[PDB]
Design a protein around this ligand. Structure first.
Ligand code: MG
Ligand code: ZN
Lengths: 515, 316, 140
RNA sequence: GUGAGUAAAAUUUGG
RNA sequence: AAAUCUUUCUCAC
């Protein structure tokens, strides 16, 4: 059906591929590809372009954002049992906490300052040293990245060490800053549509548009290229350490460590890789490896090809193409005048993943579609009604609900099928507020979040420091006694007003109800 | 006094020397890029013909035939499914069926192209039942017009091998279709073709979570007229059926590899392209090596057939 | 002994950000296991039961949107809507009332939302999410 | 239904 | 048996 669309359609209406296949084969194939590239027989990994035009940030103070260093996402932590190295899958929060415990540092900034201000590599920072930190930070674990539309055979992604994550965060922040300084297209506040619009404005003058993707992007970004860029922008010892770890990185496949001298392991440094090209020329609008350029004559095209080759941006001959009337970037397709190309485009379907969260996601998708002119509003209303009917078919059974209130959705035992316009204008029962895209999280969302918080990799017996005062800074240090005092005070306050749990706060509703 | 990002440590020179001693990449060859027109109808026809010649077609539609009523009432369907489970010697425990395995051939199953049934009125019910059964496996589950049976597949060890499936246990999904193929099963005067599908939990969840009706409605908003097609996906105006397109959509829902998405992305590029790379853009349509199995292979074949039909009926 | 000692072994003081990161239970992720998780032990059923008699009769009844202007289709553009953050005094008062302190603190930061729109009016006014086609204006 | 161990225990699966 | 190295664990209360 995607083939018979009048306009542009990417066929995203279904979910991406998935399977229980082990990640061993994909990771091994990626490592072998990187090794072959290192030999110089498949693709270019030697950077020749000049990056002297990039500004130097060496004088900027060393600043670290603590929030980016803690997350529920996975990471690899290295321990020593009896001489051998053991790589354990944990959460980035737990990995960073273990690193701080080992180094006896109260914050990542203290750790990085200590690392940068040691006399030698053998000097001990807590229970470790910079030499041991560099040795441990070169270990990566492998996993499968599934649900990637257009990739029937899934790719391998990699979990890194917390120390690697710290240094990577510093260098990537500075690389993003340099990218923002280079061109206004790389501003922090710019969506994919805005970047496509700016690209359309940039390339309108010339005749032909080259829409290019790169082949094996991460495997052709060598540690030498990263070091070149980092020295160009002035990262100093942090960049040197990161390049050293990247060169000596090893990937755990099943139960064996495999050396991977080449590549950067699937998007470890997106901004630095982008700078590798952006720092050599200006007639390219690129993000990661998706780029667009414009030209008039074959000589300009040859110059473009030479520029791409010199920056280790190997053009993908299977996807890159030349257009005259369309402009494709970030999966967004526009006309040369900047208008959105007619058709579904990149519109994606909403799978059944909960009676209420599914409706909220469908409402968000339909709002995005109608606002951008993909479809008329009445079509969105009809589709929302159909989705409500399908949700009622899937979920209106005793397994999910025992209620029969009239205001409830038909999928929860009620008899209400609200209109899309009624929901978007808040002209609905308050139970439907959670179905609004800007409304609070749905019941199923909170249930799933709590259950996820209770998983093996995330479960902890620690006492939660929740419902905190909005004047206490998070950089403030605290002991167990402090936690007990704050929790007791908050509990007493809640008991002093007749409550046992804090009331969920929605900023949109609060502002709307304000006199 | 405040440490700067460009701060130079005492070990900087040592690490730089170590990096110098470490290996470096060799210069890669410069590629010669030739720009030519995108592929014509003949290239897609050749790809489809190569797939057809290499793999061939199954006699019946197998599980894809489960999208149509089997002609049996609910009680007959339940009886037939339970007696099929008994006939295959599936273990019975706690009122549920379990399939036991001891040894594996470690060879991929034979894969051929499934012919298209006439229609798929029960696509929604089939997807809902697939979603429901794999989380409620063991017993026969019914819908308004069809029923299926999800049987956990667990190893046979001995007296105490395994009683309940775990998060990684696979399921054999068994469904009924009208008789008339090698998979017929007869019991107490009731006849029906029994078709099975071996799915791991992730594939089952992916298949069951798709919204067939909403996807069909969304596709119809800005869609050109669909030609009638034959059992093999060829343009057959005299005797073809348009409803087969629905079946194709159902196949896309059943295919957990979603190779049709790759074909669709490449076809979008093709439709937007004025010039492409010689001999390399065309290879983007050769996705047989990327997948394995009857369902993914059939989905890829029919996606290529859809591209061919679009180029034939509504040239761009 | 104490869980604090086991978790942050070797350190008697940790930043509040680090301490809170260990007890995050509000992050939702869309995954294939949603249906199985929601069915297991009737967790969603119990959650709906609890919501319908402990949380639903606390939501304020906000008014519906009324203002709307005539609009017409136009070239795709980016609409920037600026949502100011809570004031310090308002946040302190709201915390004193008994609202979730984490959410109250989260609303202090000023927000900018960039959304693509393909509709415009004679006055070039900004529209509510999902209602640019009908023309519901922020009027702020 | 509670916790604990394993290069993993399903928010799995990273930038 | 099949979409075939996958259909998987142990211990205490
Ligand atoms: Mg690429
Ligand atoms: Zn058959």
């Amino acid at each position: 059906m995607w083939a018979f669309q009048e306009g542009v359609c990417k066929g995203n209406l279904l979910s991406g591929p998935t399977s229980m296949k082990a990640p061993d084969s994909a990771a091994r194939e990626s490592i072998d590809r990187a090794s072959e590239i290192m030999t110089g027989k498949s693709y270019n990994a030697v950077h020749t372009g000049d990056l002297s035009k990039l500004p130097n940030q060496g004088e900027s103070p060393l600043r670290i954002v603590d929030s980016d260093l803690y997350s529920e996402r996975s990471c690899c932590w290295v321990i020593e049992k009896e001489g051998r190295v053991v790589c354990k899958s944990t959460t980035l929060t737990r990995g960073m906490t273990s690193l701080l415990n080992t180094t006896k540092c109260s914050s990542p900034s203290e750790l990085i300052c200590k690392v940068l201000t040691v006399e030698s590599l053998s000097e001990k920072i807590g229970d470790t040293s910079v030499e041991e930190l560099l040795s441990h930070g070169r270990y990566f674990k492998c996993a499968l990245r599934d649900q990637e539309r257009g990739k029937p055979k899934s790719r391998a992604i990699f979990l890194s060490h917390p120390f690697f994550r710290l240094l990577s965060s510093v260098v990537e922040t500075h690389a993003r800053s340099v990218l923002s300084k280079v061109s206004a297209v790389y501003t922090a506040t710019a969506s994919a549509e805005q970047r496509a619009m700016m690209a359309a404005q940039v390339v309108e003058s010339r005749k032909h548009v080259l829409n290019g993707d790169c082949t094996k992007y991460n495997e052709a970004i060598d540690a030498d290229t990263l070091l070149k860029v980092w020295d160009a922008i002035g990262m100093g010892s942090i960049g040197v350490m990161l390049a050293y770890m990247v060169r000596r990185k090893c990937v755990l496949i099943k139960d064996t460590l495999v050396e991977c001298p080449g590549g950067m392991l699937m998007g470890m440094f997106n901004a630095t890789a982008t700078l590798a090209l952006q720092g050599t020329t200006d007639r390219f609008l690129s993000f990661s490896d998706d780029f667009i350029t414009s030209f008039n004559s074959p000589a300009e095209l040859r110059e473009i090809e030479d520029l791409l080759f010199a920056s280790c941006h190997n053009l993908s001959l299977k996807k890159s193409y030349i257009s005259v009337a369309s402009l494709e970037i970030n999966s967004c397709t526009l006309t040369r005048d900047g208008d959105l190309a007619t058709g579904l485009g990149c519109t994606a379907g909403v799978p059944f993943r909960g009676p209420l969260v599914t409706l909220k996601q469908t409402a968000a998708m339909l709002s995005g579609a109608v606002d951008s002119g993909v479809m008329p509003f009445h079509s969105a209303e009809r589709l929302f009604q159909i989705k409500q009917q399908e949700c009622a078919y899937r979920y209106n059974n005793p397994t999910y609900t025992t209620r029969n209130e009239d205001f409830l959705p038909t999928c929860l035992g009620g008899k209400t099928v609200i209109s899309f316009q009624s929901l978007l204008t808040w002209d609905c029962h308050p139970f439907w507020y959670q179905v609004h895209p800007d409304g609070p999280d749905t019941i199923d969302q909170k249930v799933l979040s709590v259950l996820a918080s209770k998983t093996r990799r995330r479960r902890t017996r620690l006492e939660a420091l929740s419902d905190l005062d909005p004047l206490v800074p998070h950089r403030l240090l605290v002991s167990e006694s402090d936690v007990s005092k704050i929790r007791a005070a908050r509990q007493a306050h809640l008991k002093s007003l007749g409550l046992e749990q804090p009331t969920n706060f929605n900023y949109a509703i609060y502002k709307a109800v304000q006199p | 006094g405040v440490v700067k990002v460009g701060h130079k440590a005492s070990y900087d020179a040592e690490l730089r020397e170590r990096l110098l001693e470490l290996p470096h990449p060799k210069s890669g060859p410069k590629p010669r890029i030739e720009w030519v027109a995108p592929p014509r109808l003949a290239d897609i026809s050749k790809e489809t013909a190569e797939l057809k010649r290499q793999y061939g077609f199954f006699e019946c539609s197998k599980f894809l035939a489960c999208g149509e009523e089997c002609g049996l009432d609910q009680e007959a369907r339940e009886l037939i499914l339970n007696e099929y489970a008994r006939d295959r010697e599936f273990e019975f425990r706690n009122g549920g069926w379990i399939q036991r395995y001891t040894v594996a051939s470690h060879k991929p199953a034979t894969q051929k192209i499934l012919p298209l049934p006439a229609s798929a009125p029960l696509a929604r019910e089939l997807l809902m039942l697939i979603a429901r059964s794999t989380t409620q496996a063991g017993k026969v589950l019914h819908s308004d017009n069809t029923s299926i049976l999800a049987v956990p597949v667990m190893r046979d060890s001995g007296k105490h091998s395994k009683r309940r499936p775990t998060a990684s246990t696979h399921h054999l999904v068994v469904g009924l279709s009208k008789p008339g193929c090698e998979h017929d099963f007869e019991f107490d005067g009731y006849r029906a073709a029994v078709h099975v599908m071996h799915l791991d939990p992730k594939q089952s969840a992916n298949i069951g979570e798709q919204d067939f009706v909403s996807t069909r409605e969304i596709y119809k908003l800005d869609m050109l007229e669909l030609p009638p097609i034959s059992r093999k996906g060829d343009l057959d105006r005299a005797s073809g059926l348009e409803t087969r397109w629905d079946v194709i959509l159902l196949l896309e829902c059943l295919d957990s590899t979603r190779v049709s998405q790759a074909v669709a992305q490449h076809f979008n590029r093709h439709r937007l392209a004025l010039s492409v790379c010689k001999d390399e853009f065309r290879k983007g349509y050769q996705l047989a090596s990327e997948i394995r199995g009857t369902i993914p292979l059939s989905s890829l074949y029919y996606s290529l057939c859809a591209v061919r039909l679009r180029m034939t009926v509504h040239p761009f | 002994m104490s869980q604090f000692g086991k978790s942050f072994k070797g350190r008697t003081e940790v930043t509040i950000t680090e301490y809170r990161s260990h007890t995050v239970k509000d992050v939702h992720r869309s995954l294939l296991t949603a249906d199985k998780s929601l069915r297991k032990s009737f967790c969603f059923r119990n959650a709906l039961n609890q919501f319908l008699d402990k949380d639903l009769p606390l939501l304020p009844i906000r008014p519906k949107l009324e203002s709307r202007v005539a609009v017409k289709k136009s070239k795709l553009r980016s609409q920037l809507s600026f949502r100011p953050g809570l004031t310090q005094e308002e946040a302190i008062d709201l915390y004193n009332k008994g609202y979730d302190g984490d959410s109250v603190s989260g609303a202090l930061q000023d927000r900018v939302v960039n959304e693509p729109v393909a509709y415009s009016s004679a006055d070039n006014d900004k529209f509510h999410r999902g209602l640019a086609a009908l023309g519901y204006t922020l009027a702020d």
